[PDB]
Amino acid sequence: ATSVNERIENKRRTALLGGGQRRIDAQHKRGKLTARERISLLLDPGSFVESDMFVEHRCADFGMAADKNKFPGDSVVTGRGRINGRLVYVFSQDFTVFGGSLSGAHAQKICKIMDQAITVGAPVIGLNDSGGARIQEGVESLAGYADIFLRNVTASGVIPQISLIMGPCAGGAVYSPALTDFTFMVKDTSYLFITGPDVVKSVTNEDVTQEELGGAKTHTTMSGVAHRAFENDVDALCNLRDFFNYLPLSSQDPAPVRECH
Amino acid sequence: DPSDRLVPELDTIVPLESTKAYNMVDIIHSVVDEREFFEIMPNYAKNIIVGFARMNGRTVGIVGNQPKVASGCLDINSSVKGARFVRFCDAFNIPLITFVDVPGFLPGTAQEYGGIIRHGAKLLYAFAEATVPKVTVITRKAYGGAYDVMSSKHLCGDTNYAWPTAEIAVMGAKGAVEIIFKGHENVEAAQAEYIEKFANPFPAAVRGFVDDIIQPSSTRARICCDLDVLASKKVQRPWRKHANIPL
Amino acid sequence: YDPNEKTFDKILVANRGEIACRVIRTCKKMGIKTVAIHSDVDASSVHVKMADEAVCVGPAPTSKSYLNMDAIMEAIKKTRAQAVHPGYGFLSENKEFARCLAAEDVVFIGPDTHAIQAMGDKIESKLLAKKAEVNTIPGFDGVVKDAEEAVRIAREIGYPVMIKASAGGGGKGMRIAWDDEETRDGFRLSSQEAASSFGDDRLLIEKFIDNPRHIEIQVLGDKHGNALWLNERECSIQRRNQKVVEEAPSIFLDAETRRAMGEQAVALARAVKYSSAGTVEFLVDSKKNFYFLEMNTRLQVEHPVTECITGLDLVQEMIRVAKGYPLRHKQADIRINGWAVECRVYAEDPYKSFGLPSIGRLSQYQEPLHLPGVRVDSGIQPGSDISIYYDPMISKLITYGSDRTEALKRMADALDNYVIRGVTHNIALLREVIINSRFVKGDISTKFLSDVYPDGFKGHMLTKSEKNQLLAIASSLFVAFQLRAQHFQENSRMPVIKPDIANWELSVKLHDKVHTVVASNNGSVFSVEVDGSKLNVTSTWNLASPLLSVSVDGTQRTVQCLSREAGGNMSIQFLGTVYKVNILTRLAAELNKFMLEKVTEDTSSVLRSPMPGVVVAVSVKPGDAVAEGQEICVIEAMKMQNSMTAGKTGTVKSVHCQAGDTVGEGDLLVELE
Numbered sequence A: 001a002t003s004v005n006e007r008i009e010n011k012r013r014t015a016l017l018g019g020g021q022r023r024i025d026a027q028h029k030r031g032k033l034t035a036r037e038r039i040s041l042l043l044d045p046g047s048f049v050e051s052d053m054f055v056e057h058r059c060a061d062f063g064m065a066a067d068k069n070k071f072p073g074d075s076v077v078t079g080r081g082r083i084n085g086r087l088v089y090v091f092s093q094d095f096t097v098f099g100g101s102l103s104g105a106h107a108q109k110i111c112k113i114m115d116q117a118i119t120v121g122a123p124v125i126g127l128n129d130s131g132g133a134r135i136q137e138g139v140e141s142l143a144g145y146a147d148i149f150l151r152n153v154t155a156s157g158v159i160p161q162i163s164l165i166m167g168p169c170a171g172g173a174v175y176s177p178a179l180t181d182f183t184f185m186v187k188d189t190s191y192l193f194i195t196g197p198d199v200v201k202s203v204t205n206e207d208v209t210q211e212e213l214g215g216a217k218t219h220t221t222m223s224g225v226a227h228r229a230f231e232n233d234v235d236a237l238c239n240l241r242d243f244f245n246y247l248p249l250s251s252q253d254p255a256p257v258r259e260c261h
Numbered sequence B: 001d002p003s004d005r006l007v008p009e010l011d012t013i014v015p016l017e018s019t020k021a022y023n024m025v026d027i028i029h030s031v032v033d034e035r036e037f038f039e040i041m042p043n044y045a046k047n048i049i050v051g052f053a054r055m056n057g058r059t060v061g062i063v064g065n066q067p068k069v070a071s072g073c074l075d076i077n078s079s080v081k082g083a084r085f086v087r088f089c090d091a092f093n094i095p096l097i098t099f100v101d102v103p104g105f106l107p108g109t110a111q112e113y114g115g116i117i118r119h120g121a122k123l124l125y126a127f128a129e130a131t132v133p134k135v136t137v138i139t140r141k142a143y144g145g146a147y148d149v150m151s152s153k154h155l156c157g158d159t160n161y162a163w164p165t166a167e168i169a170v171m172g173a174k175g176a177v178e179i180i181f182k183g184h185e186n187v188e189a190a191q192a193e194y195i196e197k198f199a200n201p202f203p204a205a206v207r208g209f210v211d212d213i214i215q216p217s218s219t220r221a222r223i224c225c226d227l228d229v230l231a232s233k234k235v236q237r238p239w240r241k242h243a244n245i246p247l
Numbered sequence C: 001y002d003p004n005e006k007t008f009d010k011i012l013v014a015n016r017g018e019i020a021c022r023v024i025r026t027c028k029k030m031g032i033k034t035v036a037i038h039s040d041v042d043a044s045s046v047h048v049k050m051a052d053e054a055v056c057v058g059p060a061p062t063s064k065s066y067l068n069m070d071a072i073m074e075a076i077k078k079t080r081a082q083a084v085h086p087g088y089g090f091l092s093e094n095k096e097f098a099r100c101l102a103a104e105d106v107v108f109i110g111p112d113t114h115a116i117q118a119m120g121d122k123i124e125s126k127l128l129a130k131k132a133e134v135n136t137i138p139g140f141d142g143v144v145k146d147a148e149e150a151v152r153i154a155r156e157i158g159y160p161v162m163i164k165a166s167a168g169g170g171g172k173g174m175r176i177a178w179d180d181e182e183t184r185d186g187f188r189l190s191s192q193e194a195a196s197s198f199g200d201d202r203l204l205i206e207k208f209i210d211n212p213r214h215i216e217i218q219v220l221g222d223k224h225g226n227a228l229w230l231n232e233r234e235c236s237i238q239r240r241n242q243k244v245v246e247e248a249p250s251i252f253l254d255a256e257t258r259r260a261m262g263e264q265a266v267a268l269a270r271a272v273k274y275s276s277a278g279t280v281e282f283l284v285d286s287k288k289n290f291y292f293l294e295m296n297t298r299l300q301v302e303h304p305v306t307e308c309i310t311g312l313d314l315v316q317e318m319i320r321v322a323k324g325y326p327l328r329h330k331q332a333d334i335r336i337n338g339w340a341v342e343c344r345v346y347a348e349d350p351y352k353s354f355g356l357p358s359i360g361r362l363s364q365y366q367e368p369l370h371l372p373g374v375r376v377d378s379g380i381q382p383g384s385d386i387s388i389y390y391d392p393m394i395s396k397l398i399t400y401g402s403d404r405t406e407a408l409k410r411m412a413d414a415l416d417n418y419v420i421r422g423v424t425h426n427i428a429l430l431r432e433v434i435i436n437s438r439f440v441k442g443d444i445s446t447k448f449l450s451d452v453y454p455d456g457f458k459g460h461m462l463t464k465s466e467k468n469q470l471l472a473i474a475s476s477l478f479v480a481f482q483l484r485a486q487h488f489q490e491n492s493r494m495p496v497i498k499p500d501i502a503n504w505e506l507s508v509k510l511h512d513k514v515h516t517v518v519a520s521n522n523g524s525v526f527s528v529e530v531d532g533s534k535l536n537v538t539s540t541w542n543l544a545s546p547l548l549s550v551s552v553d554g555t556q557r558t559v560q561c562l563s564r565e566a567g568g569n570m571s572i573q574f575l576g577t578v579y580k581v582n583i584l585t586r587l588a589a590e591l592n593k594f595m596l597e598k599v600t601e602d603t604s605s606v607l608r609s610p611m612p613g614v615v616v617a618v619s620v621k622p623g624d625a626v627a628e629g630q631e632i633c634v635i636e637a638m639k640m641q642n643s644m645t646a647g648k649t650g651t652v653k654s655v656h657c658q659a660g661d662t663v664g665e666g667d668l669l670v671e672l673e
């Protein structure tokens, strides 16, 4: 009946709008901004070429084939671009659908971007925003984590890897930021903890909250995991720009030289 | 010492109960040659046990869990100890044998404040960088990301074998059943279905996570054959001045 | 035997251990389906894996697992087995089980409930023995307040007496009962003591037996009145009222006495209308004058040895006669085919009170199946385990030869080649007892190992010749282990050069002495000089083998090595005994004579558990003081109990044991000043 053009347009508009305008305004009023405009702001204007824009997750089990819980993009935005004229491979988790939970397509696209970057020799910037994992897919999803880890260990000392975390990351995915070189946070927006406060409350039996377990202040003051903490997101990206400007593209290139006076 | 001898003691070494614990050093003693094992720093970080042994006259380094103390959970001390041992073994080209029985990372506020993430990353980096032939055996359990940390198949693992008691999951079934069915409450039937479906190696076996399922009494021979076939393991990696371990 | 004869189609085995495996094996040989039950812990046992079905009775403790009836009837109903087998122990001699089983439409393999009732009690058993014209222990258990009447009854029954009193009399007439005047003196003194201690001044007459030795006649019977006696057994060696080592033919009594005991036993069995198998025990004195005592109505643990001198096998004969088929043999067709000796290997440490029960897991286990004339009855396999709920019996060994000396030699050779690692055992006790001069001669008694060991088992005492043999073996094995460690591969970059030394000078510390040894190698031949003594030892020197065979200047010795520490300490199983040796070089010993001794603070003041069990009752409390000879607590362990005292007087600072608690192996229990 209808041509494929209208279906493609509907898929594109649903991906841009996410799960609906209500979620969009709720996220805007929450205090943080989605991944697409973050990538637009981090890099130069009109220099971003996204790769594999149309990828969706498939799962025969649990009866998720309906369009109610089907969304293209797999809550990951990956691409390449130029900042100040220098090439960068950029990564952004997306919390609009499933809370940025990682799956097979997630890890597949992630591995594609990192091994392409290692081949060319450009740095890898990764913006992390997730809050859980799909329990329906199960152990298979865990396998993806393992794959991702390998890439990091293959790139240690070959290219600089920078990880900015700006969501309540938890579980087994807190290790990929820890295998990179420099870790930065945003105050009162990004959390790190391997296990949730409920588990420690049930087992160790003491009253603890999430702020004093995975807050930016705790990790940047006493835990010694992250390097700096920023007040919000736009300023975090502005600081990430010139911090990247400091560093070279790879270990083969020498230290950058800036005109001075 | 024959290289193809059976070990009829390992068929009932692992109890079938999900909470029962066993002395896991006995498996190491039984498998190795002449029942000899030189254990390194045995009084510190008892969660993980590492040491030197000989298989078919060839020196190997053995790293394994210990389900007797702290239920086998790994922490900062275990991570650093295992990472340093594996780092030495690879630096001096010695094959590794891993015995995996882990339910995850030990939770708590002390481990959270001490930087358990850094030490877990240390141990994961030590296993992921390693290029010497490593043989891993999953005896009973592998829960959460600790399974991928402790020498998973995807991290350039060579051969993975699982005993019939092995079972791999993600998070506790008691919480899984109550979190999957958010619409209403389910009892008896849901738990029975979960323990009949996901409490088995089959979902891993059909997925290619492990090579196959072997009888415990014939573990040693298999391992020996591995050490006679994967001694030519040379790999290629991109040029690098030096690595950056999360020290 | 013809397998075409009709018999049962499904047999339930309702026991545990080696007897269940034996019954299952014979029943499968006959061609009958078997069904075995199991408890909570025995789900992986050998008998469960050997039979078809695996019914679980219930929890771990035997008081509600193998001794509850409702589970048994439920298992039978689910299995519809036409017959059951009780083995021995547990509920084989339970009247309630027999009657409840006969209530249903199944047959209980064994004796009738009437025989169980008529042999369970003692007074009516004695009455029936009197009615069966069987010579029993005599004695007048009546009131005797006068010395002359007491000595009259004594001289009527003989001066040696067990004259004793119901409540007690501090010996009454028993003590010093050889002549008569001192029996009168004992009469008056025991009357006084009873008046001060017990109260029964009168004397109950009984006859004395000198150096008791008890012989068991095995009887078999059918449902048609025909009964047979299958030779005899001697079981004079026993500790803590438990038999240890047995031999089928008994040398003490000749053919005529054995025959007469046979007719008496068969007459007693017939007087009860007895079917299936059983045994009658007699207590023969030193003059071949026996007296009846006890009739066991079951299949005993020491039953196979008799089989080894007859060619029969009792389990299938009784499972056939339970159907109703009459016996085919006759008393004139039962002969003696050589000799047989049976030993029972337990799981206990003989060095403390003759076999305190132990636990653990069986790290490795191998039997000498290929040795000549050796048969094994074992209820465990490698990788098994021992619990505190059931009998610690590991296995039993039977050796049959043409004469007694051949059987004893075969038994010693088999005991040398039995490897058990993981738990302790009493192989040393058996091997040391079986070579005793007065046991090979044949002069034993009921207290055989209670007087030759006044201070308990102290290991096998070794003479100078075998001291030198052991020292040479240890030195040669140490040198072989050192030499094996100098063989590497060709590095092709840094060449390896093998150190060359003509002979090695060693210092060997054994027990509390040090000896200077020199060992020289000539290939596979070691020449060892120990304190001026030359010895030569040869072997293949297989260091990875569990057991080794050596030839010390002609004599062949089978030895085992364990706990070979890199610091020089070794433990060596030689001639069935474990010796600890410390082997050093000359320079190492000279330097060690300079290092200060690591002082250890352990002189009593600690009353940890001698060997793990479960504490039941505690007679002391923290802060109290007790004197020597007073027991601290009672510990139940695998159907056995012990009460241990303290060697010094002091106040207990802490007690770590209470009622219902679980005690570990060597766990601290009592701390006192």
Ligand SMILES: *C(=O)CCCC[C@@H]1SC[C@@H]2NC(=O)N[C@@H]21
Binding pocket: C016, C088, C089, C090, C242, C243, C301, C390, C391, C639
């Ligand atoms: C527990 O397993 C039952 C005890 C089996 C031992 C049998 S029965 C009682 C007899 N006494 C003994 O020492 N062995 C025989």
